[PDB]
Design a protein around this ligand. Structure first.
Ligand SMILES: Cc1ccc(-n2nc(C(C)(C)C)cc2NC(=O)Nc2ccc(OCCN3CCOCC3)c3ccccc23)cc1
Length: 254
């Protein structure tokens, strides 16, 4: 990818190594693709440059339908990592704007798609550590994609809060919090608490209540993901099966 093919529009945020810009990449076909362009401060250490670069090296290998996509890297200074964006933005904000028209089936679909992404990550023993609607892009009305754009106490498992332990089992907890967000049309988990109060509530056995539109069977699955004991939470691999069941049940009802 040639730098002249990428036009930057505005700053999206301050990344860990430098600003992230929104841009338009015009490919060889002349079609315009929305992109996020990550940059790296010039005066960084060699180790930090290597870390910056590693995202490109890693993400080149990801081609899952529900994981975000690397468009390319321009290695020449200033080094840019170019990621694919879509018209619709973050899922959180998409749910907020479309709450009056989204059907429960679609909310279960998004949940299932993110679960499939996580079953892939689980297969290579990779941990996300930050599963939430803010980390999900809407590629189309029928397709969401999991990313990592950026402690999230209100999403975290008790072992992550208490010991900073993060495993696939702690990801399953967070994923069920993410499901709760989706079925709540983007509401923030424990918005009625301060971060400091969260562990006390979880320790005493309290949990996020069932979202109004959430099917009871799906809520039961969420609660299993929120078992205090990490060993009692389902694997993502099996949760795909359970969520597929809920989807088919909801499709039939429809
Ligand atoms: C070293 C390293 C290695 C791997 C990763 N990594 N790993 C994952 C998995 C776990 C899902 C596979 C995802 C990522 N990285 C990312 O997802 N990086 C990205 C960061 C910021 C972005 O845009 C920010 C701007 N934001 C986008 C959403 O809309 C509002 C603005 C992105 C926008 C589109 C696509 C990717 C983006 C990360 C770092």
């Amino acid at each position: 990818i040639a730098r002249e093919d990428v036009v930057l529009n505005r700053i999206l945020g301050e990344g860990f190594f430098g600003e992230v810009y929104e841009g338009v990449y015009t490919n060889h076909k002349g079609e315009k693709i929305n992109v996020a362009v990550k940059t790296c401060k010039k005066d960084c250490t060699l180790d930090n440059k290597e870390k910056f670069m590693s995202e490109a090296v890693i993400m080149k290998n990801l081609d899952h339908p529900h994981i975000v996509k690397l468009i390319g890297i321009i290695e020449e200074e200033p080094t840019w990592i170019i990621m694919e964006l879509y018209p619709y933005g973050e899922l959180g904000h998409y749910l907020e704007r479309n709450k009056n028209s989204l059907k429960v089936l679609t909310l279960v679909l998004y949940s299932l798609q993110i679960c499939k992404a996580m079953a892939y990550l689980e297969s290579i023993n990779c941990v996300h550590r930050d599963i939430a609607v803010r980390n999900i892009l809407v590629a189309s009305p029928e397709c969401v994609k999991l990313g990592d754009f950026g402690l999230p106490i209100k999403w975290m498992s008790p072992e992550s809060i208490n010991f900073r332990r993060f495993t696939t089992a702690s990801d399953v907890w967070m994923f069920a919090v993410c499901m709760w967000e989706i079925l709540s049309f983007g509401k923030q988990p424990f918005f009625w608490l301060e971060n400091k109060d969260v562990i006390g509530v979880l320790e005493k056995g309290d949990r996020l209540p069932k979202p109004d539109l959430c099917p009871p069977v799906l809520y039961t699955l969420m609660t299993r993901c929120w078992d205090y004991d990490p060993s009692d939470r389902p694997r993502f691999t099996e949760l795909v099966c359970s969520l597929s069941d809920v989807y088919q049940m909801e499709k039939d009802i429809a």
